[PDB]
């Protein structure tokens, strides 16, 4: 079994992430995650807070995951790339997910709160069984540092 | 066992993809795929049709794969990058493979039909046993939607 | 078991890579590797020699690995990206590791010898047990061509 755990850490965030235990019966590799906020991306590098904590589990243990762009992210309307190609998150990290996005255009670019620019892929490309959305207050032992 | 299935969906395509059951005894991760057509890549984003359908199989089931640049793709002659870093293709997709390629240069760039700009890597980085090239007419149950 | 083998192939290199058998008890996916030399990256593509040979082993056999940027690589001070998104190295390759890095800025950029711009991830994202740093002279059968 491979499971994902997402907890919003802001009010606007929990709007887009109502508590559920979503299953993945389509056998989709990637877990889409929302921007949760209208932002303007300037030419060059931008830091985009995702307002969530995330844990991935494989065969009972805490595991790593990768952040990868969706096809949607880069159009003729917005030349956006993930700065580090794909983000690796080690099992040890328990802070907020944050993206480095390069706007390659010479003019600024707007993204909308509902948009999913990236998806989360489990270490080793293991398809997730459930995506557990937790509510803001509930303190998982998974997000405790060590 | 991990096997790949490639079917050309155009005449010029089947030129480069004669029906075979290629084996991979070198233990190469990546399956090189040709452009099949002379194209000119303008500054900014370009959509590059690959004129093939592709299925990947691991342990009997249909599985996902990733599209990754080859070292060849980006030279001093052509600043080309894959727009989404690496393409993830879910098992469910059965249409034509298409690339988003960013020309970072300020002048247009020519690619030739014989050139392999990208390779296909099986979900979980599993080395393929055989690369089955199918012929244009043969209707695999693998490319049937569900 | 998954093990990494790094051998410096220059004197300045062995400075940063003293012979050890480092273990990875943090369960980190990525093996950080140093630039080993002050270089200036011009706008456009740059080739960055890493002055090491590397082998990866999974379950006794020689295996493949991937080169991925660290978060550190791209800042507001330096718009650097890996040109091929992530580097795949086939088990067969036994030469020096070399990076293609795109400086997206319009002015040149300095990197310092101690800096780790990239990390090595084992095929299939398998966490390494030990990182064996070998010394310059010792001829591993792993770096012999076939």
Author numbering:
A (entry chain A), B (entry chain A), C (entry chain A): 2 to 147
Paper quotes:
Deoxyuridine 5'-triphosphate nucleotidohydrolase (dUTPase, EC 3.6.1.23) is a ubiquitous enzyme in DNA repair that plays a key role in preventing uracil from being incorporated into DNA. dUTPases are widespread in organisms, including eukaryotes, prokaryotes, and some viruses. On the one hand, it catalyzes the cleavage of dUTP into dUMP and pyrophosphate (PPi), which reduces the possibility that dUTP will be incorporated into DNA through DNA polymerase. Herein, we determine the crystal structures of ASFV dUTPase and swine dUTPase in both their ligand-free and ligand-bound forms. We observe that the swine enzyme employs a classical dUTPase architecture made up of three-subunit active sites, whereas the ASFV enzyme employs a novel two-subunit active site.
ASFV dUTPase (aDUT) gene consists of 495 bp and encodes 165 amino acid residues. The results of gel filtration experiments on the recombinant protein and static light scattering measurements indicated that ASFV dUTPase is in a trimeric conformation, which is consistent with the results of previous studies. Ligand-free ASFV dUTPase crystals grew in the I213 space group with a subunit in each asymmetric unit, and the structure contained 146 visible residues (residues 1–146); the remaining C-terminal residues (residues 147–165) are flexible. Comparison of the prereaction state and quiescent state showed a root-mean-square deviation (RMSD) of 0.519 Å for the active sites. These differences are evidence of the conformational changes induced by dUTP binding, as active-site residues are rearranged to provide a tight pocket for the substrate. Comparison of the postreaction state and quiescent state showed an RMSD of 0.364 Å for the active sites, suggesting that the conformational changes are also beneficial to the release of the product. The results of the thermofluor assay showed that ASFV dUTPase was denatured when heated to approximately 83 °C, whereas swine dUTPase denatured at 62 °C, indicating that ASFV dUTPase had better thermal stability.
